[PDB]
Design an enzyme around this catalytic site. Structure first.
Site, PDB file in Angstrom:
ATOM      1  N   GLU A  35       0.812  -1.204   0.000  1.00 40.26           N
ATOM      2  CA  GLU A  35       0.000   0.000   0.000  1.00 40.26           C
ATOM      3  C   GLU A  35       0.870   1.289   0.000  1.00 40.26           C
ATOM      4  O   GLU A  35       0.696   2.172  -0.817  1.00 40.26           O
ATOM      5  CB  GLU A  35      -0.953  -0.030   1.206  1.00 40.26           C
ATOM      6  CG  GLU A  35      -2.051  -1.084   1.085  1.00 40.26           C
ATOM      7  CD  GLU A  35      -3.018  -0.813  -0.076  1.00 40.26           C
ATOM      8  OE1 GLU A  35      -2.938   0.269  -0.699  1.00 40.26           O
ATOM      9  OE2 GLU A  35      -3.890  -1.673  -0.327  1.00 40.26           O
ATOM     10  N   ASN A  46      -7.747   8.503  -6.134  1.00 38.16           N
ATOM     11  CA  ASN A  46      -8.516   7.527  -6.895  1.00 38.16           C
ATOM     12  C   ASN A  46      -9.225   8.271  -8.037  1.00 38.16           C
ATOM     13  O   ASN A  46      -9.468   9.485  -7.975  1.00 38.16           O
ATOM     14  CB  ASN A  46      -9.501   6.784  -5.982  1.00 38.16           C
ATOM     15  CG  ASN A  46      -8.811   6.029  -4.846  1.00 38.16           C
ATOM     16  OD1 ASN A  46      -7.862   5.298  -5.079  1.00 38.16           O
ATOM     17  ND2 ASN A  46      -9.291   6.183  -3.635  1.00 38.16           N
ATOM     18  N   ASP A  48     -12.285   8.140  -8.850  1.00 32.93           N
ATOM     19  CA  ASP A  48     -13.581   8.664  -8.435  1.00 32.93           C
ATOM     20  C   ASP A  48     -13.495   9.973  -7.647  1.00 32.93           C
ATOM     21  O   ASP A  48     -14.539  10.465  -7.135  1.00 32.93           O
ATOM     22  CB  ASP A  48     -14.360   7.596  -7.634  1.00 32.93           C
ATOM     23  CG  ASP A  48     -13.861   7.435  -6.179  1.00 32.93           C
ATOM     24  OD1 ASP A  48     -12.645   7.510  -5.942  1.00 32.93           O
ATOM     25  OD2 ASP A  48     -14.699   7.265  -5.269  1.00 32.93           O
ATOM     26  N   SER A  50     -11.857  10.287  -4.682  1.00 29.63           N
ATOM     27  CA  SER A  50     -11.506  10.016  -3.313  1.00 29.63           C
ATOM     28  C   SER A  50      -9.944   9.862  -3.238  1.00 29.63           C
ATOM     29  O   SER A  50      -9.216   9.797  -4.290  1.00 29.63           O
ATOM     30  CB  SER A  50     -12.238   8.767  -2.820  1.00 29.63           C
ATOM     31  OG  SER A  50     -11.726   7.574  -3.393  1.00 29.63           O
ATOM     32  N   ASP A  52      -6.593   7.897  -0.940  1.00 30.53           N
ATOM     33  CA  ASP A  52      -6.058   6.966   0.042  1.00 30.53           C
ATOM     34  C   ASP A  52      -4.912   7.605   0.827  1.00 30.53           C
ATOM     35  O   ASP A  52      -4.059   8.270   0.259  1.00 30.53           O
ATOM     36  CB  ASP A  52      -5.517   5.755  -0.628  1.00 30.53           C
ATOM     37  CG  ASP A  52      -6.533   5.024  -1.422  1.00 30.53           C
ATOM     38  OD1 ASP A  52      -7.789   5.120  -1.207  1.00 30.53           O
ATOM     39  OD2 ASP A  52      -6.015   4.322  -2.298  1.00 30.53           O
ATOM     40  N   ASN A  59      -9.171   5.060   2.570  1.00 34.35           N
ATOM     41  CA  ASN A  59      -9.915   5.776   1.546  1.00 34.35           C
ATOM     42  C   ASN A  59     -10.949   6.725   2.185  1.00 34.35           C
ATOM     43  O   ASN A  59     -11.730   6.347   3.077  1.00 34.35           O
ATOM     44  CB  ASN A  59     -10.563   4.746   0.575  1.00 34.35           C
ATOM     45  CG  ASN A  59     -11.215   5.361  -0.672  1.00 34.35           C
ATOM     46  OD1 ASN A  59     -11.613   6.507  -0.710  1.00 34.35           O
ATOM     47  ND2 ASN A  59     -11.354   4.556  -1.697  1.00 34.35           N
ATOM     48  N   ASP A 101     -15.612  -5.029   8.542  1.00 33.18           N
ATOM     49  CA  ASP A 101     -16.893  -4.665   7.887  1.00 33.18           C
ATOM     50  C   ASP A 101     -17.457  -5.656   6.884  1.00 33.18           C
ATOM     51  O   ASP A 101     -18.390  -5.315   6.142  1.00 33.18           O
ATOM     52  CB  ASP A 101     -16.865  -3.198   7.372  1.00 33.18           C
ATOM     53  CG  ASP A 101     -16.745  -3.081   5.883  1.00 33.18           C
ATOM     54  OD1 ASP A 101     -15.982  -3.869   5.274  1.00 33.18           O
ATOM     55  OD2 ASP A 101     -17.424  -2.193   5.325  1.00 33.18           O
TER      56      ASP A 101
END
Length: 129
Positions: A35, A46, A48, A50, A52, A59, A101
């Site tokens: 990562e 990202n 979209d 967003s 990280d 994110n 989650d």
């Protein structure tokens, strides 16, 4: 901060990541490696819109507030900048909520593609834990 491998393992261990929801310490270290290359200040944008943040590339779409991901959530109730700190506390606590989650460590695309199924124990080999 750029951690050493064994240095990060120790800090992850101290913070209770070792076997958290059944993921051995080496999974977490392998995740961080791919990562962020162990750099607490890594960020990646990202497609979209967003972003990280930090050692585990958490994110802004769901987990932290950066004030610039329209429609996103802040489920860890932190500013995303908290995830760039030299102290990994905030990153670890948020990771615990992410890995809980439902999809486990598959929430990290790099873990799934590069750590999952591998000899992750190598990532803590030689470390004084």
């Amino acid at each position: 901060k750029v951690f050493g491998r064994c240095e990060l393992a120790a800090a992850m261990k101290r913070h209770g990541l070792d076997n958290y929801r059944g993921y051995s310490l080496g999974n977490w270290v392998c995740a961080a490696k791919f990562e962020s290359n162990f750099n607490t200040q890594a960020t990646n944008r990202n497609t979209d819109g967003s972003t990280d943040y930090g050692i585990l590339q958490i994110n802004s779409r769901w987990w932290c507030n950066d004030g610039r991901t329209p429609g996103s959530r802040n489920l860890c109730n932190i500013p995303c900048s908290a995830l760039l700190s030299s102290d990994i506390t905030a990153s670890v606590n948020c990771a615990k909520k992410i890995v809980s989650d439902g999809n486990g460590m598959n929430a990290w695309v790099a873990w799934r593609n590069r750590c999952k199924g591998t000899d992750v124990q190598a990532w803590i080999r030689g470390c004084r834990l």
